[PDB]
Design a protein around this ligand. Structure first.
Ligand SMILES: NC(=O)c1ccc[n+]([C@@H]2O[C@H](COP(=O)([O-])OP(=O)(O)OC[C@H]3O[C@@H](n4cnc5c(N)ncnc54)[C@H](O)[C@@H]3O)[C@@H](O)[C@H]2O)c1
Ligand SMILES: NC(=O)c1ccc[n+]([C@@H]2O[C@H](COP(=O)([O-])OP(=O)(O)OC[C@H]3O[C@@H](n4cnc5c(N)ncnc54)[C@H](O)[C@@H]3O)[C@@H](O)[C@H]2O)c1
Lengths: 319, 319
């Protein structure tokens, strides 16, 4: 039932996944197990999320029960910022493999086009914004391409099946494509009615790069983090344009918001933190939006970005 | 006096210059010669402007009459998109040198973070959007850093005093800073009240990069090219906010638009096509805008971009 998308690398990636950011450590395993029982097969995780050991427990538990085999589960992870230097890339990937308890991850992405100064894993893991000097941010001179080549070597070594990037603007992705032997199979960016970036999406899809949207419900996710910007933003669930389209097809606003992406070939990985949501978030491909619908939603685009490195330390990623 | 800006390369750069774009070949020489007579010292040129040979005639004549010495003239040039591949960098720079009839250029900029397929000089010069296959665009897989390194070597050979980039968004600039040995001394971008990109300016300036603004008069220059977008945009010269501020200080809208940038440490290179504009465009530093003025002008920022590769061939530079 859940459509697969064929990546430029030859492997299939489910179009509907399970988000693991801010997935509580104490219940991470159980939630992953339930998601697997509910039908999810792609798990979008990350070194920075700090819950890979658990995500691993969930997947292993399902595998041990015979519900699924390793090849049926699609595991996505992300290289955190302190590990861009080539000499530390495999190290970080190993930590990820050890925590997830597997021989390979299906998708590994450069989490951010930012290079924090390396912090040994034994000193602090996950490091988050720590750069080895108290609260200060510290960076290291590592061009993306260097990190990317380190990743290509790891694909040949069999530790990764497909590699990609996250939070990359158009210019950066274009340049990376000039030096890449293995083309980034995936581009994972914040995508929702308030931040549509139609041109970025067009370029990437045309280049054969698969788009995975994150924070498909816009401000919601950051509201849960008490972020001021998100709090001051009218929810997409209660937006007049969204409710209308929802009523028209007798669907829920949440279903329209996910369909809006899916129908354009964009993979989604919603955070389903309630049994009911687990079902809701993978059964929305039951209707089609019309051109008129898309034009109406396209109007909501105001370039409102909630996940912005500029907020951390004025990093110019999206300026 | 036109104050100078000490570049990170250590060399001084006139904070006000003479734009050479669209400067006709038949009169380019005379115009530059006159600008020199009127006090201008920086001349922003470009291989793509197709008039470097004439810009040289103007300076040579000024030198021959003893009006100035080579040391006193600041010549800026830009490496066009078909010459990114390293081996073509020195040939292109040389054609610029022979054309300008000088031994070195004070500033050489990567014109665009776009690498067009090389086209021999003798086949067409300047090539513009010509890529060697009729009207089709063809590109080269040459990462920015490859080109950048090619430029650094030329600085060592004493053929360029300072190097920099033009039309580089934030992410891309940050990534070059990681691979650059010689940091980009300059960043030249479209900059006017309709496209302020304040964060880009802030980041660049804090990284020690100098900002050179172009199209300081908004849609004006592109209105003189019959560009749809420019013609359907209220000129900054008539705009209520500028008009009011200009009236307040008994200055023309052009003086207000130029001071808006200069006061913020940004270099300007207006195109003075008339004897009076020539003078005025270099005598506007006679008043300061107030905090309130900046606040009012800041409201004009709608991120309206006139020079966009997206229009050429949907090149994702600014998306
Ligand atoms: N690479 C990155 O930079 C990055 C950044 C953010 C998120 N992600 C990934 O994408 C995932 C999804 O993004 P997100 O975590 O911000 O959350 P989201 O946007 O998917 O959902 C946010 C919130 O809305 C609620 N919600 C979910 N489904 C709902 C439904 N059907 N009805 C009503 N409310 C519902 C939940 O409370 C949830 O916490 C993450 O778990 C993570 O894996 C990646
Ligand atoms: N690197 C790049 O990508 C790039 C792109 C465009 C321009 N540039 C450079 O920067 C310069 C500025 O850009 P531009 O020439 O497009 O536009 P501009 O802002 O210099 O001026 C645009 C037009 O307004 C008029 N104008 C000039 N001074 C005036 C005054 N005092 N009062 C009223 N009208 C006036 C002229 O007719 C002129 O053609 C160029 O000459 C060129 O050297 C660089």
């Amino acid at each position: 039932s859940i459509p697969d998308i064929k990546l430029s690398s030859g492997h299939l990636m489910p179009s509907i996944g399970f988000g693991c950011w801010k997935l509580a450590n104490a219940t991470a395993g159980e939630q992953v197990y339930q998601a697997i029982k509910a039908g999810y097969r792609l798990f979008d995780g990350a070194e920075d999320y700090g819950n890979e050991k658990e995500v691993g427990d969930g997947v292993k538990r399902a595998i041990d029960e015979g519900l699924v085999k390793r090849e049926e589960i699609f595991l996505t992870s992300k290289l955190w910022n302190n590990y861009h230097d080539p000499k530390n890339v495999e190290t970080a990937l190993n930590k990820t493999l050890a925590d997830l308890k597997v021989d390979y991850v299906d998708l590994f992405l450069i989490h951010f086009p930012i290079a924090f100064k390396f912090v040994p894993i034994e000193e602090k893991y996950p490091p988050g914004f720590y750069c080895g000097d108290g609260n200060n941010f510290v960076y290291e001179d590592v061009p993306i391409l260097e990190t990317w080549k380190a990743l290509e070597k790891l694909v040949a070594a069999g530790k990764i099946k497909s590699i990609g990037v996250s939070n990359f603007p158009g210019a950066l992705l274009l340049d990376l494509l000039r030096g890449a032997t293995i083309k980034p199979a995936v581009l994972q960016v914040e995508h929702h009615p308030y931040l549509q970036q139609p041109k970025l999406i067009e370029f990437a899809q045309k280049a054969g790069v698969t788009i995975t949207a994150y924070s498909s419900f816009g401000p919601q996710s950051f509201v849960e983090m008490n972020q001021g910007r998100a709090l001051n933003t009218p929810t997409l669930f209660a937006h007049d344009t969204i409710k209308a389209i929802a009523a028209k097809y007798n669907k829920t606003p949440a279903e329209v918001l996910l369909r809006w992406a899916a129908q354009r070939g964009i993979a989604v990985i919603p955070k389903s933190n309630l049994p009911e949501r687990l079902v809701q978030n993978r059964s929305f491909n039951t209707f089609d939006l019309t051109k008129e619908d898309f034009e109406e939603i396209a109007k909501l685009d105001i370039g409102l970005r909630f996940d912005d490195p500029w907020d951390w330390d004025n990093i110019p990623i999206f300026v």
